[PDB]
Amino acid sequence: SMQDPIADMLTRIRNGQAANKAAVTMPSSKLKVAIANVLKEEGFIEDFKVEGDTKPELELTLKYFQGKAVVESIQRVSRPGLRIYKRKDELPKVMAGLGIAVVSTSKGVMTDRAARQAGLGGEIICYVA
Amino acid sequence: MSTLEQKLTEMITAPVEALGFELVGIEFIRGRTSTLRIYIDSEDGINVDDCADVSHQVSAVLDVEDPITVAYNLEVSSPGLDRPLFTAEHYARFVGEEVTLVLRMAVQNRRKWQGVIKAVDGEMITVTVEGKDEVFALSNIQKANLVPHFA
């Protein structure tokens, strides 16, 4: 059965923007919108929105620059199979800092660059260049 | 069966006694890497350099008279400490030395024994195994090797 929403959220983006779609939808959840907004709040996605009452639908707007997908590689690192946590000093880098890593710090889910400024360690959700 | 081994022995007897050396140890075994072993009993000393002179001499005669069903895999060989002795001349010289002898038609209490030579006969050898000197008929014995005392 399905055993991970985030992975399915990610691939839906990956396979989504793979098909060069405009906007891909999936059932919403806190972590997701929490995740999803950080992209836009970083510039990875155009925009997102939640639709329906008593039913969770997340519709986020992708983006293309010069006919090329704005995101190119997105890898869920912490998996339901094996969990991953990293101390603040040890928060990784993506493409020498060109990429962003989503880390669920205790205070809030946020970018690893902000987490290093906040001096806080967290579960590495996923990677994105 | 002797694969013309006596004929081969006559063919290789002329070279071995030609450079003067002394012939013992004719053997051949076909199969993967089929090979024959020829032993030179050099009293002076069986150096591979002395063997080298005999080996070129025996190969040169051998190619014209190539043996039937025998490949060109000769082993010009020093008869080691465990040299195998078949003739009564050996046991004659090998006066009081031990030897391990195995025979063709194996039977209960066959002469497969290892012991010291005490007497020598043309078709029979007396060798001390079982704690007593006993008669051995080399007629049925197809394999027998002189043994040095070791650990």
């Binding site: 199979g81 094996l82 969990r83 991953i84 | -």
Partner: protein, 80 residues
């Protein structure tokens, strides 16, 4: 304030004793999958009070048997 440790009781058959399986969950040395590791700790239970399968808090004391070096401070749940 005091070192104390909580475990579930595997067995209470022992007279005035209990067998407690305590669970500790760890990062794994090579890989990193957190796997449960359990110890069959022998524990002194006075009154033969506890019951098999109960959850219970335990503190260590001077050794008391060949295998029991721990005694129970109190029980957390009950009525298993």
């Amino acid at each position: 304030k005091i070192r104390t440790l909580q475990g579930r009781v595997v067995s209470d058959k022992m007279e005035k004793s209990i067998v407690v399986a305590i669970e500790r969950f760890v990062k794994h040395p090579i890989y990193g999958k957190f796997i449960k590791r359990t110890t069959k700790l022998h524990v002194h239970d006075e009154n033969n009070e506890c019951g098999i399968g109960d959850v219970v808090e335990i503190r260590e004391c001077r050794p008391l048997s060949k295998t029991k070096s721990w005694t129970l401070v109190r029980v957390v749940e009950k009525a298993v």
